Write a protein that binds this ligand. Sequence first.
Ligand SMILES: N#Cc1ccc(CNC(=O)N2CCOCC2)cc1
Ligand SMILES: N#Cc1ccc(CNC(=O)N2CCOCC2)cc1
Length: 282
Amino acid sequence: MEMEKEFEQIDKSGSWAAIYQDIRHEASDFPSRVAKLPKNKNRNRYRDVSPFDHSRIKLHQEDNDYINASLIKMEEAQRSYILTQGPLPNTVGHFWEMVWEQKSRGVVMLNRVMEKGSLKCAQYWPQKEEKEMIFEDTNLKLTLISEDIKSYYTVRQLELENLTTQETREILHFHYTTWPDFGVPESPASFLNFLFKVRESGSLSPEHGPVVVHCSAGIGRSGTFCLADTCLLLMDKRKDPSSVDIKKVLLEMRKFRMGLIQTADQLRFSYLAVIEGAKFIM
Ligand SMILES: N#Cc1ccc(CNC(=O)N2CCOCC2)cc1
Ligand SMILES: N#Cc1ccc(CNC(=O)N2CCOCC2)cc1
């Protein structure tokens, strides 16, 4: 079926939970043996969210190459994304090592450091120009260059220096600051505006490594971001945009990381975002 009218048909019939449970039943199951090794317990935020072995990102290290991060490669759309958990106190150096080694231009953050009164990820970037951060375990230096605070999101320019080689690179930090502590946003308008700002920066384009996107677990809000982006790109590429099947795209993405889209409300919000976004594109 088309999307907008399939949407109204699920609303009127109140069957979002049944649609979402079908997706969960059909989703791929692949091994994640490296994630579960005992030496990696303090590298995982949640025991039930792990990268598959076949698609995990490897650190360029011989001691321990593990990080909770996955490469999502969308062949027809010609987009790639790295989805990862919010960094932990003992993985902030690994996080920036990955950004460096994978040649990413941008980092997309969809959570606040504290939500619901609890810490959802480490403070992993510097908050003042004159107070830089040094990650001694991976030999990297990180400096805040500039910050632009808007009503729904903040964009930061960061300088990442490989201290072994003295090479430097400019990284863009796109921080969506207004996702509610509970539920999903009422309108997709600010989330779409944010997506378009990431796109306009070049961070999603083939001349760079894959964008790094995270929330707390790296599957819920993060899944919504890449699902909406890929669906809108396919609607632009194809002769028949009504042929784009958001459930099929989500199942394809779940071949590369488990659990993408965590609730039926997140599924409905993804439909809403693609529907409204397709009208603005034209
Ligand atoms: N990029 C991309 C991309 C990702 C997932 C899908 C899922 N759809 C799919 O398998 N089909 C079957 C054959 O053509 C119609 C849609 C398609 C494209
Ligand atoms: N290449 C690049 C690039 C650099 C920085 C940004 C973010 N903007 C920023 O730092 N400011 C400073 C305060 O007023 C103006 C905007 C985006 C792209």
